[PDB]
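Work package 3, deliverable 3.1, input record:
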Amino acid sequence: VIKPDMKIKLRMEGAVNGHPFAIEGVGLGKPFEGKQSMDLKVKEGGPLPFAYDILTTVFNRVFAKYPENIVDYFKQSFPEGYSWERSMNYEDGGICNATNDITLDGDCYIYEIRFDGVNFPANGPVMQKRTVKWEPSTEKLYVRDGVLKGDVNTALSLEGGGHYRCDFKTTYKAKKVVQLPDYHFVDHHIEIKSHDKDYSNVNLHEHAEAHSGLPAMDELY
Amino acid sequence: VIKPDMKIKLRMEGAVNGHPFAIEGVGLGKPFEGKQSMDLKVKEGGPLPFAYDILTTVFNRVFAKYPENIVDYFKQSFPEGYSWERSMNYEDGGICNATNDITLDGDCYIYEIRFDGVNFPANGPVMQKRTVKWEPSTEKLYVRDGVLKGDVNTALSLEGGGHYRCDFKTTYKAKKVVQLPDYHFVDHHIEIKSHDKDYSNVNLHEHAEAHSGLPDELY
Amino acid sequence: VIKPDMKIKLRMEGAVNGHPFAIEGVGLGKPFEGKQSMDLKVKEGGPLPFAYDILTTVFNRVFAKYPENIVDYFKQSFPEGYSWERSMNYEDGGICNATNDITLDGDCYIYEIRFDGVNFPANGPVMQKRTVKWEPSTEKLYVRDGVLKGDVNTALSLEGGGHYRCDFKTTYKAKKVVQLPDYHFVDHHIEIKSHDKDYSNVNLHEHAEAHSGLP
Amino acid sequence: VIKPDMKIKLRMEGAVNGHPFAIEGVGLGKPFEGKQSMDLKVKEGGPLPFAYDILTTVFNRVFAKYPENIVDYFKQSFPEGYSWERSMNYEDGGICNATNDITLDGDCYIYEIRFDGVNFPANGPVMQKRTVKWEPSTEKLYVRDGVLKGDVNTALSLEGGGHYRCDFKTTYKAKKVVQLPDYHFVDHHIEIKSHDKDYSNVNLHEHAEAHSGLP
């Protein structure tokens, strides 16, 4: 169903602490290698008054390299696709709720995304854009009530040292009856390679791999 | 600026588990008695596939009886108004973020409300309409970083008995420099007096009073 | 069962951020007025290098004024008694777990308390003793899993102004089966009325009345 | 001058939901391979009425293979040692507070451990011991105000399928000023390899290596 090279087109509508914005984007990736890149740009609400890193992870776990021994919940959902919902709980009390509907049209994944962040205080690193980058992460994926769940705790590196902690709790809902996997991990590394002054344009890359944890195939042969 | 009798008008757009809906409403209340009434009507996404009670609390702190000794942050905020944000943390992980921008036009308040709930599981009492009502609450209101915040932990009663807990953390942002108050409380009681089968029409009542905690002079 | 005037005797053992201490205390109160006072003294590990207010709340719903319309779970559990467990999660990451075993010996309540706090940062207001007092609170009490639970989220006022909030999760387990109440609330006001510089002696008061909220 | 093979001696005192217990243990491991095993016997409060898996993780991140590019905080803290504090919050409300004071005596690590768990409900999988094993994990270690921190959120596989989640919040405090490392991870795998009916005897294994995540 899925070629080695596919395209991405998306649109995100949302608000942060009550001020609306919208962002559209187009990009490419390869699902069997867990790598993807995209070009995003603010089309409403610009220039955005919050740190851009708050959106990076909301911008499709199909771009995760899955080994044969682990069941792929994502590539198994197509051509029908899947949707996901997520609430990102920040350390300072800022909460971001997100939704993404993923569909397939030939070689392009289409995302309908909604984003709502609240209770970010004026002095925090989000309202004042003091974030640098998300550090690499490790997601825990488990089955609960027939649905695939994703748990991550991670942080954002700040200018001048330190980390800003966030708790991810994702629910993955495939649109068709699919084979569920066992408890496993997905490692993540998200990166904005290039952007402009006000982040009206962003170059975003993400590499992701799935694994079982501490077990290797390295038998020197 | 504020009559003892005022009117309410508002429209809410939002989504629950990714399924959009919209609701508009109009009503009246008494700001100095902490009581208000509303009639709410669904306009999109109906019939709603989730328990209605999660929107009741999103549907104004000006309807709170404030004693002279406690500074009222809300009535001070008018005629220019205030906005507020809130996260509602449900005990099983469903989280609802809500937004409300308030203005006043003559004698009526207009609310621009946004509501977004996620990670509500299929088997829970929100997706399966297993809630009965909100219990009365007591909100803790405090100042942090120049704005008034409101914290309340409360619960929802279920059919077969029991309670479903939710944590509210509200940020009130007044648009006009205002006098901040001391640590205080607001007692709450929300009720839906009448609704229809699919909850496509709802009558909502709320009574609220402010106090300073444990303090009759027969005179 | 409970006379209008009784006294309290207690001992608390515990540690905060890994450093042990012990405290005993004696005091009295009136259960039908929800008021009680006690005199506590540090007996081990003193002087305590953490804010004293984090232990205050841990040293007995028996001192709560209950109206006829609300079931009193505590005075009804006596003379057999009850135990309780609680976790206190502070906004900055410090967690305090405590237990209190309540017994009655004639006219006195005897407390066997355990208290354990961890993950308090050096610069926070507990390690730098930056608390003034607990603000008055309102506890929400409900039955869950056949047992009565009490939830409170309150805060501690700080010196330079501001509040440090805490999440309370209490479990009340009567030692003998007692008739359960419905959802209701209890308002609390606790205060250290007199103490010495190192808090080796503390006079602590608590006033409490029970209600069913706004009609 | 700390060898590839070391010995472990350990004692734990604590309580769960108010009922006291004690456990002693002896074991061995290789800190440069991230492998260790130990034998643990109950000494007080036995037979334990709660799931044993909640204590396994309290039973020393010196047993982690650290690559050269990552700073070892733990092997640098010896021979003076270090201490750690931790909270463990389970999704159903049971919370466990623990402390470990680590010591070195020749070639043996000595643990002084305190453990306190509260609010574990009767029907939950801990009081009815329906836990099977901890799933493998990955801990996030970062510095926050001059101290090394460890964050890991996991679950416990339940018997009959499903997972019971826990959030770990550890504070690592070396008793000697040491070089702090940058953001990095430690992968874990713990197994109760042998045990008794009521768990009066347990042989416990842990494998651990540190890494910097995906490139």
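Chain B has one domain: 1-219.
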